[PDB]
Amino acid sequence: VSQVRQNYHSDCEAAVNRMLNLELYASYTYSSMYAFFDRDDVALHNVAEFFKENSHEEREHAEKFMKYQNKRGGRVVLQDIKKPERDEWGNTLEAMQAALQLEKTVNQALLDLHKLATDKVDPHLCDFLESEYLEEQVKDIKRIGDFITNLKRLGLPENGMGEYLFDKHSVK
Amino acid sequence: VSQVRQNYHSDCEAAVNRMLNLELYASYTYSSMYAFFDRDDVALHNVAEFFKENSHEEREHAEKFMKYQNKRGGRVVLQDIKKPERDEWGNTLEAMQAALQLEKTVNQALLDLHKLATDKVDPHLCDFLESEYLEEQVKDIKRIGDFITNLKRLGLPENGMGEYLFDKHSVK
Amino acid sequence: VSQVRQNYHSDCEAAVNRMLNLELYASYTYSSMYAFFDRDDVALHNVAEFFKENSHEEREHAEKFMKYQNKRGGRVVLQDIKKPERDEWGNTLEAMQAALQLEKTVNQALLDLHKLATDKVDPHLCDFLESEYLEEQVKDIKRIGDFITNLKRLGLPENGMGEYLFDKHSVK
Amino acid sequence: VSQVRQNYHSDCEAAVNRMLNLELYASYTYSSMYAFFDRDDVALHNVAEFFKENSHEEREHAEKFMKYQNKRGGRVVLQDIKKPERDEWGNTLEAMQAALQLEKTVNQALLDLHKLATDKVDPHLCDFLESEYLEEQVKDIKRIGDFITNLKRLGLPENGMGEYLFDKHSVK
Numbered sequence: 001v002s003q004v005r006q007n008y009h010s011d012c013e014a015a016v017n018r019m020l021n022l023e024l025y026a027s028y029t030y031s032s033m034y035a036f037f038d039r040d041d042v043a044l045h046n047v048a049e050f051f052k053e054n055s056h057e058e059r060e061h062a063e064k065f066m067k068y069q070n071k072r073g074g075r076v077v078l079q080d081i082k083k084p085e086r087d088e089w090g091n092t093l094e095a096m097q098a099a100l101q102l103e104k105t106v107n108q109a110l111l112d113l114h115k116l117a118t119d120k121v122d123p124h125l126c127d128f129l130e131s132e133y134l135e136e137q138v139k140d141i142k143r144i145g146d147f148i149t150n151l152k153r154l155g156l157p158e159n160g161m162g163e164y165l166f167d168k169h170s171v172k
Numbered sequence: 173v174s175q176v177r178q179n180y181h182s183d184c185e186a187a188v189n190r191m192l193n194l195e196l197y198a199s200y201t202y203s204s205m206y207a208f209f210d211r212d213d214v215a216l217h218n219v220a221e222f223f224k225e226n227s228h229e230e231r232e233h234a235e236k237f238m239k240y241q242n243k244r245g246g247r248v249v250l251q252d253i254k255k256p257e258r259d260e261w262g263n264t265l266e267a268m269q270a271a272l273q274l275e276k277t278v279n280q281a282l283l284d285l286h287k288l289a290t291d292k293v294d295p296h297l298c299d300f301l302e303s304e305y306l307e308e309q310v311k312d313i314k315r316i317g318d319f320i321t322n323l324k325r326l327g328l329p330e331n332g333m334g335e336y337l338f339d340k341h342s343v344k
Numbered sequence: 345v346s347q348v349r350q351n352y353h354s355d356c357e358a359a360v361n362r363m364l365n366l367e368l369y370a371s372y373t374y375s376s377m378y379a380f381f382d383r384d385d386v387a388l389h390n391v392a393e394f395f396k397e398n399s400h401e402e403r404e405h406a407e408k409f410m411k412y413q414n415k416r417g418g419r420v421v422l423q424d425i426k427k428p429e430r431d432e433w434g435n436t437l438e439a440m441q442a443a444l445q446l447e448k449t450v451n452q453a454l455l456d457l458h459k460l461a462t463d464k465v466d467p468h469l470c471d472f473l474e475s476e477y478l479e480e481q482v483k484d485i486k487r488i489g490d491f492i493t494n495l496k497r498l499g500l501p502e503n504g505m506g507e508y509l510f511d512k513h514s515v516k
Numbered sequence: 517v518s519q520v521r522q523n524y525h526s527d528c529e530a531a532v533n534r535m536l537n538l539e540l541y542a543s544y545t546y547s548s549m550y551a552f553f554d555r556d557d558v559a560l561h562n563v564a565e566f567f568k569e570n571s572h573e574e575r576e577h578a579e580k581f582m583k584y585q586n587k588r589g590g591r592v593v594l595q596d597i598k599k600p601e602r603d604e605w606g607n608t609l610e611a612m613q614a615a616l617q618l619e620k621t622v623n624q625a626l627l628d629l630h631k632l633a634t635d636k637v638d639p640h641l642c643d644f645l646e647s648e649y650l651e652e653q654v655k656d657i658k659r660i661g662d663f664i665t666n667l668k669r670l671g672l673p674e675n676g677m678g679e680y681l682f683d684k685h686s687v688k
């Protein structure tokens with residue numbers, strides 16, 4: 001019964017709320033990675049800042065879904081933001097592997113929401129996902145996979161010199 | 173039998189002509205609103221200019237469909253532009269309510285055309301509607317709904333001071 | 345057993361983690377307020393943006409505690425960020441009243457942490473709280489109290505014109 | 517019996533003189549490190565310059581205590597500046613480990629002086645230490661610990677390539 005609401009299915013409204021929870025969850029996981037790489041016994045500042053920037057990106061993605069919900073006449077419903085799966089992230093390779101899996105999880109949720117929007121015949125929601133989320137997801141997954149290939153090349157996890165070189169030349 | 177025509181169904185060609193008629197109809201309705209708010213016994217110039225700008229926007233939307241028709245090899249067929257439903261628009265709240273309904277009518281026609289384009293497997297027409305029309309429609313509907321909420325807050329229709337304040341602070 | 349750790353009590357390390365949880369909780373509450381005032385049936389955009397900016401400020405405060413933890417050789421430990429107390433915030437006056445109470449809650453936690461830092465004879469932590477948190481808290485509480493006084497003056501909650509005027513002249 | 521003296525305990529005056537001796541001692545130790553890394557058989561110029569800059573910083577810290585002593589009406593009393601503990605510093609890792617211990621020694625003296633100032637109820641001296649010394653100490657200790665973690669990662673002391681890479685990418 002919002003005066004603006006048109007062609008917006010209740011199931012899509014709910015799925016949008018779940019999606020923005022997941023973006024906040026992803027933001028929090030990257031926050032955790034930032035703090036781990038900033039530890040004095042880890043001390044890879046370029047890596048830390050990479051994850052810090054990703055944390056802000058994911059928060060922005062969540063805010064964009066809140067704005068979207070309101071534009072369509074749906075109602076934002078928030079739930080707890082669950083803490084990350086780990087308290088410590090091992091090393092740059094383990095963290096990047098976790099980041100790749102997180103990005104693929106977020107991507108799968110976006111594709112699932114696109115499929116729901118398709119089934120409910122909601123082209124505005126389809127366009128929004130395609131224009132604002134799906135391409136950035138593919139780019140981010142490609143970036144992280146490329147990093148993982150380089151970290152393996154550099155001899156991670158055992159090769160500390162390799163880890164240092166990555167921090168100084170791949171995320172500088 | 174246009175040399176450029178490819179994957180363009182006769183039903184979509186006809187629906188595009190009907191859509192650009194409706195954009196011209198919407199333009200004319202907003203023209204009428206501009207003239208009403210410019211009356212010396214109405215005299216809400218910021219509101220009048222808001223509607224005047226919307227009238228030009230809708231005309232541009234019509235022209236874009238004419239260009240689209242030709243790009244696909246369809247043929248522009250014009251029909252009369254029907255005069256607006258009312259000759260006078262009451263006050264800012266009544267006008268905005270009429271504008272909201274008009275915008276939702278235009279939006280429904282765009283969504284119907286997108287569904288036809290989907291059924292005829294015409295991704296160029298789908299993309300055109302998504303990229304050029306559907307998002308602006310959602311933004312415009314949200315803007316007008318927000319205005320209506322504020323006009324009600326301000327005590328319209330009875331509260332003339334409220335109407336004055338809206339003209340001076342919401343469409344300045 | 346961090347190599348950098350000096351004069352940093354385990355209880356202060358734990359209290360810093362709890363404090364940065366509370367800053368994230370406060371950020372999330374302000375996010376919720378932003379989304380409520382952006383609703384088409386609420387539509388007070390200046391108020392919404394005020395709360396959105398406060399949400400980002402609180403997130404920055406949390407990040408600063410993460411950096412602080414690491415600088416002292418403590419270890420960041422994250423917990424779930426609990427969803428806000430309410431899903432809808434009534435009106436500008438109710439929201440500002442909730443904001444005042446939230447700010448006083450955060451302030452009390454900061455003062456409690458300062459007292460713990462005092463008891464553990466940790467002048468670096470005392471200075472950090474005084475220089476980076478306690479003054480901004482007093483300023484923010486004063487700002488919100490001033491707003492509440494003005495919203496009451498303007499006749500909230502009943503006086504919708506008053507609410508409109510505040511949005512247009514106090515948070516413009 | 518200085519005309520300016522107020523609320524300045526004789527024990528704090530004496531402790532300030534001892535503190536500025538220790539800053540000069542720290543300056544001299546870093547001078548020694550600069551000269552060692554500038555040796556033709558050591559030849560790590562970026563590391564050498566890092567230590568040279570730290571030597572000047574510590575001298576400035578000493579001068580600031582002299583100015584402070586006079587501002588409070590105490591009397592500067594100088595003692596010999598003892599030569600550093602070592603004549604040669606092994607390698608970048610050994611030097612950084614010595615630097616970390618020196619920084620923690622200076623920090624402990626500053627915290628001890630803050631405790632004395634607290635016991636003598638001297639808030640001006642407390643503020644001075646907090647504002648001018650204690651935060652820079654925490655930052656410097658964190659910087660050196662981060663370096664040590666990276667030097668170990670790079671395989672020091674055995675890995676000469678690692679040592680070269682640190683000089684070229686961490687203190688450039």
Ligand SMILES: [Cl-]
Pocket residue numbers: 005006007008009
């Ligand atoms: Cl609907």
Ligand SMILES: [Cl-]
Pocket residue numbers: 008009010011
């Ligand atoms: Cl529904």
Ligand SMILES: [Cl-]
Pocket residue numbers: 013014015017018077
């Ligand atoms: Cl929901």
Ligand SMILES: [Cl-]
Pocket residue numbers: none
């Ligand atoms: Cl759960």
Ligand SMILES: [Cl-]
Pocket residue numbers: 085086087088
């Ligand atoms: Cl873990």
Ligand SMILES: [Cl-]
Pocket residue numbers: 101102103105
């Ligand atoms: Cl995952």
Ligand SMILES: [Cl-]
Pocket residue numbers: 177178179180181
């Ligand atoms: Cl065709």
Ligand SMILES: [Cl-]
Pocket residue numbers: 180181182183
């Ligand atoms: Cl056909």
Ligand SMILES: [Cl-]
Pocket residue numbers: 185186187189190249
């Ligand atoms: Cl036709």
Ligand SMILES: [Cl-]
Pocket residue numbers: none
């Ligand atoms: Cl007819």
Ligand SMILES: [Cl-]
Pocket residue numbers: 257258259260
């Ligand atoms: Cl009429």
Ligand SMILES: [Cl-]
Pocket residue numbers: 273274275277
């Ligand atoms: Cl209509």
Ligand SMILES: [Cl-]
Pocket residue numbers: 337509
């Ligand atoms: Cl006014």
Ligand SMILES: [Cl-]
Pocket residue numbers: 349350351352353
């Ligand atoms: Cl400790």
Ligand SMILES: [Cl-]
Pocket residue numbers: 352353354355
């Ligand atoms: Cl402890």
Ligand SMILES: [Cl-]
Pocket residue numbers: 357358359361362421
């Ligand atoms: Cl904890």
